[PDB]
Design a protein around this ligand. Sequence first.
Ligand SMILES: CCCCCCCCCCC(=O)OC[C@H](COP(=O)(O)OC[C@H](O)COP(=O)(O)OC[C@@H](COC(=O)CC)OC(=O)CCC)OC(=O)CCCCCCCC
Ligand SMILES: CCCCCCCCCCCCCCCCCC(=O)OC[C@H](COP(=O)(O)OCCN)OC(=O)CCCCCCCCCCCCC
Ligand code: HEM
Ligand code: HEM
Ligand code: HEM
Ligand code: HEM
Ligand code: HEM
Ligand SMILES: COc1c(O)c(C)c(C/C=C(\C)CC/C=C(\C)CC/C=C(/C)CC/C=C(\C)CC/C=C(\C)CCC=C(C)C)c(O)c1OC
Ligand SMILES: COc1c(O)c(C)c(C/C=C(\C)CC/C=C(\C)CC/C=C(\C)CC/C=C(\C)CC/C=C(/C)CCC=C(C)C)c(O)c1OC
Ligand SMILES: CCCCCCCCCCCCCCC(=O)O[C@H](COC(=O)CCCCCCCCCCCC)COP(=O)(O)O
Ligand SMILES: CCCCCCCCCCCCCCCCCC(=O)O[C@H](COC(=O)CCCCCC)COP(=O)(O)OCCN
Ligand SMILES: CCCCCCCCCCCCCCCCCC(=O)O[C@H](COC(=O)CCCCCC)COP(=O)(O)OCCN
Ligand SMILES: CCCCCCCCCCCCCC(=O)O[C@H](COC(=O)CCCCCCCCCCC)COP(=O)(O)O
Lengths: 54, 126, 93, 93, 248, 385, 385
Amino acid sequence: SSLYKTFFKRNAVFVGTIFAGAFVFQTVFDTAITSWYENHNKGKLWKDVKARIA
Amino acid sequence: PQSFTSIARIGDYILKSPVLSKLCVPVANQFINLAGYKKLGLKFDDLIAEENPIMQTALRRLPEDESYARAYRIIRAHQTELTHHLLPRNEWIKAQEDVPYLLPYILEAEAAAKEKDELDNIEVSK
Amino acid sequence: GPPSGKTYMGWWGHMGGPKQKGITSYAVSPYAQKPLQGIFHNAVFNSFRRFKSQFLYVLIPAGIYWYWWKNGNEYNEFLYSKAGREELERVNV
Amino acid sequence: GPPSGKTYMGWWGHMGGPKQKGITSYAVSPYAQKPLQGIFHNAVFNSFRRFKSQFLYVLIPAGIYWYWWKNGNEYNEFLYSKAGREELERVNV
Amino acid sequence: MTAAEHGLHAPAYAWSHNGPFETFDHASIRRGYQVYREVCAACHSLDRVAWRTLVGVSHTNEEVRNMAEEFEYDDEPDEQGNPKKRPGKLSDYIPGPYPNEQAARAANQGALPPDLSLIVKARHGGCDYIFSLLTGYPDEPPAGVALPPGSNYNPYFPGGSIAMARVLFDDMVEYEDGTPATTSQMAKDVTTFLNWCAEPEHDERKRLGLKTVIILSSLYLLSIWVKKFKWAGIKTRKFVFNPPKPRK
Amino acid sequence: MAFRKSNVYLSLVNSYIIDSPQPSSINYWWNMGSLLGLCLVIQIVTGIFMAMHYSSNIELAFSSVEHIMRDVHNGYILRYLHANGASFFFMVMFMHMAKGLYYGSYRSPRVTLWNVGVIIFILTIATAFLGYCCVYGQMSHWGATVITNLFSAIPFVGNDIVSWLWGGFSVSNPTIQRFFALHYLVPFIIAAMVIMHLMALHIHGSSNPLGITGNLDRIPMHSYFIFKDLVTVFLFMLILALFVFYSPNTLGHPDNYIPGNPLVTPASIVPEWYLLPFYAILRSIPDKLLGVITMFAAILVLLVLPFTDRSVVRGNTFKVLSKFFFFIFVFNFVLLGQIGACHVEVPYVLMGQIATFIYFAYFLIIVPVISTIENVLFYIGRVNK
Amino acid sequence: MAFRKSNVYLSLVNSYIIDSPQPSSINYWWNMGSLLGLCLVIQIVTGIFMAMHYSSNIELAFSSVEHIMRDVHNGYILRYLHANGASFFFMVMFMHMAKGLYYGSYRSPRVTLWNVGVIIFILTIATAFLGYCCVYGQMSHWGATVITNLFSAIPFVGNDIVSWLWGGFSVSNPTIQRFFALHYLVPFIIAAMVIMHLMALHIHGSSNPLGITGNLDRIPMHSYFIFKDLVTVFLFMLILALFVFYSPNTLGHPDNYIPGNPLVTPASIVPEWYLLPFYAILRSIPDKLLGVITMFAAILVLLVLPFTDRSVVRGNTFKVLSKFFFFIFVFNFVLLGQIGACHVEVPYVLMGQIATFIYFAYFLIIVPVISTIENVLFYIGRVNK
Ligand SMILES: CCCCCCCCCCC(=O)OC[C@H](COP(=O)(O)OC[C@H](O)COP(=O)(O)OC[C@@H](COC(=O)CC)OC(=O)CCC)OC(=O)CCCCCCCC
Ligand SMILES: CCCCCCCCCCCCCCCCCC(=O)OC[C@H](COP(=O)(O)OCCN)OC(=O)CCCCCCCCCCCCC
Ligand code: HEM
Ligand code: HEM
Ligand code: HEM
Ligand code: HEM
Ligand code: HEM
Ligand SMILES: COc1c(O)c(C)c(C/C=C(\C)CC/C=C(\C)CC/C=C(/C)CC/C=C(\C)CC/C=C(\C)CCC=C(C)C)c(O)c1OC
Ligand SMILES: COc1c(O)c(C)c(C/C=C(\C)CC/C=C(\C)CC/C=C(\C)CC/C=C(\C)CC/C=C(/C)CCC=C(C)C)c(O)c1OC
Ligand SMILES: CCCCCCCCCCCCCCC(=O)O[C@H](COC(=O)CCCCCCCCCCCC)COP(=O)(O)O
Ligand SMILES: CCCCCCCCCCCCCCCCCC(=O)O[C@H](COC(=O)CCCCCC)COP(=O)(O)OCCN
Ligand SMILES: CCCCCCCCCCCCCCCCCC(=O)O[C@H](COC(=O)CCCCCC)COP(=O)(O)OCCN
Ligand SMILES: CCCCCCCCCCCCCC(=O)O[C@H](COC(=O)CCCCCCCCCCC)COP(=O)(O)O
């Protein structure tokens, strides 16, 4: 569409979208893979074992 | 590094013998279609390695009309191999077009450099 | 600079192949054709064709050597048993 | 190999100087002449002519700075004496 | 080698930290330090494990500052150069029970008991062997085997004759959280704990791998596409050859 | 002209990685050259960042490796990238010298490329052995003993080279301290022998899997083989990232986590896997002098290969008999790795002697006879008379 | 053709050391490039044979330099050839950066050659500093403390860079142990930037002490400047051997034989004698942030020299004023190597502030002004109007 003119035409704004798209991919994909890895291992982590010490 | 004068000496002894020509010529053409260079569209003398001066010589003495076909069956084989396909069955080199077209130009440019080394090394008697 | 010897590769323009003539090559831009148009019918039908040709050279040199290994690794565990100690004392001696 | 840029030096044969014509260059073999033929009268008379030219370009840059370093190193040693503590109290503060 | 001189093959148990997405059982390490202290702290050093690594993994911050203040380490000497001792802190290592190697050999009939910091990575089998060693002691060895005086039998040790006697007996410890302390329950808990001591990164090595295999296999499917994109002008080239006029 | 050809430094980048005319029909086996260039940088960048924490004394060798893996931030990443990225050095390199044997890339005019190949292969066996000896485990101490005791079989100069290598009377603190400062060095000899290896390649160009000339259909390197080499970079970084994060101690030996103790021999005293087929050759000769020579002639028999290949076509691609006997050799190099990791027992002492003969009759009997029967069968199959 | 031209390796030897046409009028100042190539091999070979005995912990650093000087056969030779030879590196190089500053070798078309000079000069300052802090003497602990605390002046990123650089909270065991694996490395980066320095020279060739074109009379390198370099090789070996056997600790500081103690500061911390001019530029600015810049600007002000020289004649050979003011610059550079050794006392602060103004007004004010006056005087002396 007109997606090409705003984003992919100037290389100064193409690669400025790669870095602003990697700044969101760092924060989100790390939190999305941490919150899955602990949820798959619910009951084995120290944050759960510290709750059994009541 | 085998020097075609040598294999034409062992070859023409096999062809002339009636026992060995019955025996190992049916193994020979079975080795050819199992090798599968016809299926890329190549005659055998396209395959001979062309980086020695006894064979780089025999690629200049080749006529112009055959050195344009030979420059096509090589690019047709570089193109067919990088698509990882084979040529269709109506483009394979048949058993009769597979002729030794570069054998007489090699054998006359190989026996004319054997003669040059039998002339830098003559011990003439007195 | 200084010269160098003869090679079998030049550069763009004087590459040193034979003179070619009457061979014309057409190609379409990759922005105008679909890439990966034939991933199917090549991963299934062409990859079997490549496997039909070059598997009998990678199965018999691995069928000779793996039958040889399994017939010795099974022989090693015979003579180091309770049943084959009388065959062990004549092979090492 | 690829063709490179335009440089101001070539090689033996096409060095890239101006075209020269009518310059004859006689020279004798070193096996037929004596080396060290003039090591004396050059170590005395020639090496004085070289020294006579380039020594007011070395001495005056070393007669400005060595006088400058020595006239500070003997003012530094006046301030740090018993006789120059009433001057050090007014220049250090 | 004979099968006796090779050791029996330690089988494949279903550990809770096998698999690629699973981590350690941090209630089985906290119950696995208690079996280390009450049973094998008598004759096994743990000389590579600092006290600070137990904080947050299986004990809190106050439970380690009251476990390191039971032992005593060498302080820097006083203002007269006499040596002196101090209670331990969080930056010290777990002290072994023997002062030197010859004291260790003298107490166990010549046999130096190995340090258990890396004992699961340094044995063929990993934790499947360290578990099955401790529960592999028969009541009486098989017939014909002549044991030397002072060597115990179990088949999982390479050679048959081991110097450690059968040590895990039922209900010899009392767990804090009310767990039935059997021989197999205790031997599972140290073998998890000794697995932690040799691999303290095992929780985070397996979740950095989840970041990397997801990126570096979606960077490989993408780079297949950009190869097939840029090579589309070469893989669909077409050559036609009509031979030229032979009069030249 | 363009600035990429006019600059003094960029003209070397242009003529090597940007405008270098590669043949169009080269398959994915030609990507092993770029993988080894990547896998050399991983063994250097994760070597400098790991030698800032490594103390080289014999009392602090093994205790500082555990200091890396427990105390340094991402030390478990740095060491496991170095121990498994060195096993992946010798697996790409073993698939780079097998592409060379198969596709005939040793023949003329590329003999001066094969010879610098065998020199780089020697300096990498040497580096992976010195670096294994810097960890000072029970397989790393006792591996240095059995290897460097082999030089005490050189006649009349035997014991004075061994006692010069050791710096004493056994593998001690003078040895591990010099096996680190030597092991730091040699990857800056390999990285200057690879530049002597791309120079011998660039004068004649790469070969191609048909064995015919590639001067007709050339395509540049940039934007064609950059992005073809980027497929196997991201595949090599994927099979590495399973052997670093998910199963890191699979290729190593368990005994190497026992600290180096010179008073107890381990049960099976065996170097790391890639040096195994050069260990079943050494151990198969029932003599000490010939066992050193036969092990050293197992690398230097790679030099007689340009002069024993009698085939007049280049490469095994269009040959039947010399394609079968290649894979007989390749699954003989694997068996020879397994005999090197088994004990010296019957029948492995006879298997290792037949499978050493097949390693030394491929290069000297099987190749110059099969590649002569094939030259006659190509001739008499077409030339009717 | 000849085999020295027909080979792929030997033609690099041929085009650089055998057949390279040098101008036939170059005096003995053109040997300092060949000495720096020899003096680099001296440091590298007496670094490998010395680092086989060196342990890099903070407890065993100074105790294992003395183990070299007492227990190793010819160990006093290696430690003294290499601690003094490093101080002969910077004296040949200071005469190599002053030949090229005098004879106009910085001008076009050799600006690429000059910029790789300043890059080699920065890595050589950084190499000789990082090995000085490996002896862990008293001047080397307090040298590394004073130098790496200058990076605590960068705003808001100061303390995080220094604490990353120390690897701790002060100059401790990780700093010395990483100042060795770095200092092992950077010579191999200098040994690659030298190859990137001969390539920038080989395209236009050497200059000649007149400053005119040397394309007319060219003689080869072999048997003419090979044997003109062997004079100054055997002389540099002679003056090194006096400073190694007869007076070895003359150049170094005596305080570097005290084992490094962080609790007691020495009397006056100075660097080794060659960093002493830049230490006097650093100390001249009464500010901490500007001092780090100006001490780094004093190496980077050599880069504005091709653009500030406004002369149509190459070099100072036939110039009266620009030969006088050059030797004021050299004897100002010696004076800055003297104010760097004196304490911060009256009047060595008014001197070190004035004699650092003359270091910077040479490139920025003196050379553009006196070379414009040296072009009108060349003109109106001949043209009659
Ligand atoms: C363990 C340590 C390893 C560390 C090194 C990591 C890299 C290993 C690389 C091994 C290798 O290079 O083998 C290449 C082999 C021969 O290549 P060829 O040119 O003859 O085939 C043309 C292909 O259709 C191009 O097809 P195309 O280029 O259009 O697609 C890209 C292709 C990339 O695949 C690969 O890179 C190899 C896995 O995408 C895929 O199809 C993958 C789909 C999941 O590729 C093949 O296609 C397999 C054929 C049989 C070879 C068996 C290999 C066993 C060792
Ligand atoms: C010191 C000396 C070192 C010597 C190295 C020793 C061997 C190291 C092992 C490396 C394995 C490399 C295998 C050989 C790879 C190069 C050969 C090759 O590329 O295979 C291509 C071959 C047929 O391909 P074509 O080129 O002929 O296609 C044209 C069709 N017209 O395709 C095929 O026929 C199938 C290829 C299948 C490869 C099988 C690899 C086996 C790996 C060993 C497995 C070990 C565990 C069992
Ligand atoms: C939970 C309890 C224990 C565990 C997990 C444990 C662990 C181990 C392990 C893994 C080994 C190595 C076996 C091998 O090398 O194959 C070993 C050996 C040994 N253990 Fe135990 N141990 C425990 C209790 C004890 C106790 C209480 C003693 C007290 C004397 C002891 C004495 C020894 C000795 C002497 C050896 C060396 C045996 C040999 O080298 O032959 N162990 N132990
Ligand atoms: C081609 C290059 C290299 C190869 C094949 C290689 C291989 C190896 C191997 C196999 C080990 C043993 C790892 C283990 O089993 O624990 C090792 C260790 C080591 N290497 Fe390398 N190495 C290379 C280059 C380097 C370089 C350039 C350095 C630079 C300092 C380095 C530093 C080390 C260190 C410090 C160790 C010991 C610590 C450890 O084992 O993790 N290596 N190397
Ligand atoms: C650090 C190790 C190595 C590096 C970086 C390296 C680098 C390269 C590169 C980049 C290529 C071009 C890509 C290709 O043709 O596949 C190449 C080709 C080649 N290499 Fe290696 N190589 C290494 C080791 C070896 C070894 C050990 C050998 C043989 C014993 C060898 C023999 C060859 C041959 C024969 C070729 C030419 C193949 C052809 O063009 O047909 N290389 N090398
Ligand atoms: C451009 C090259 C080099 C320069 C300018 C240089 C300079 C220095 C200097 C100034 C010192 C301190 C000497 C002292 O105060 O005693 C030193 C020490 C040292 N350097 Fe180098 N070095 C160079 C190359 C190397 C290399 C390549 C290595 C190692 C392979 C090396 C290893 C050492 C070692 C081990 C010390 C030990 C401390 C001592 O005994 O002096 N150096 N170097
Ligand atoms: C390890 C240090 C160095 C080495 C091995 C080296 C090497 C060389 C060599 C061999 C030459 C040719 C011989 C000559 O012209 O004198 C040369 C020329 C030159 N070097 Fe270096 N150099 C080094 C450092 C430097 C530095 C630090 C600078 C300047 C900041 C520099 C600037 C130059 C210049 C300007 C020339 C050309 C002079 C001319 O021929 O007119 N070099 N270099
Ligand atoms: C322009 O014309 C030129 C010119 O072309 C050249 C080249 C030079 C000369 C300049 C140089 C040669 C500088 C280049 C210097 C290097 C490339 C440095 C490389 C030096 C090294 C020593 C490489 C490192 C290699 C080693 C240390 C290997 C030694 C092995 C050791 C120490 C281990 C020993 C162990 C055992 C078991 C023996 C000129 O002077 C010159 O002007 C006349
Ligand atoms: C024929 O066409 C080619 C081709 O021309 C090339 C070049 C390659 C690629 C091959 C290579 C690149 C192999 C060459 C490898 C090297 C030259 C190795 C170079 C690596 C080094 C010299 C080591 C790297 C060292 C550094 C980057 C120094 C910096 C490192 C550290 C740790 C500094 C840390 C300090 C601080 C303060 C952070 C091909 O694959 C190829 O076929 C397509
Ligand atoms: C590598 C780092 C730079 C080092 C700078 C050294 C530059 C000078 C190298 C001198 C080599 C001399 C060989 C010339 C030659 O062979 O000419 C040979 C014969 O010359 C000789 O016989 C000279 C006698 C041997 C001299 C020994 C010098 C060794 C000292 C080494 C010191 C430097 C390491 C050919 O000379 P011709 O062509 O005139 O006949
Ligand atoms: C491992 C190295 C072994 C030897 C192999 C050499 C391969 C080197 C490849 C390096 C690639 C990157 C180099 C890019 C530099 C291009 C810029 C350039 O050349 O411009 C140069 C100036 O270069 C510099 O100032 C600094 C160069 C330092 C490079 C340090 C890495 C000027 O270019 P120009 O030719 O137009 O000169 C006009 C003269 N007035
Ligand atoms: C960063 C680059 C570092 C510097 C690299 C370039 C400078 C290196 C200088 C090397 C000079 C010494 C090399 C002399 C060897 C020449 C012999 C030769 O080229 O013969 C080669 C064969 O070379 C080899 O087999 C091994 C060479 C390995 C070299 C290892 C040092 C055959 O040469 P050619 O193909 O011209 O044969 C004509 C037939 N009559
Ligand atoms: C410089 C040599 C390094 C080569 C590494 C190749 C080996 C592959 C395994 C790498 C794992 C180490 C990284 C990691 O743990 O990150 C993990 C994430 O995984 C990745 O991102 C891998 C992506 C690799 C991209 C390759 C591009 C290389 C560009 C180099 C430019 C200097 C952990 O990340 P995190 O600490 O959570 O931010």
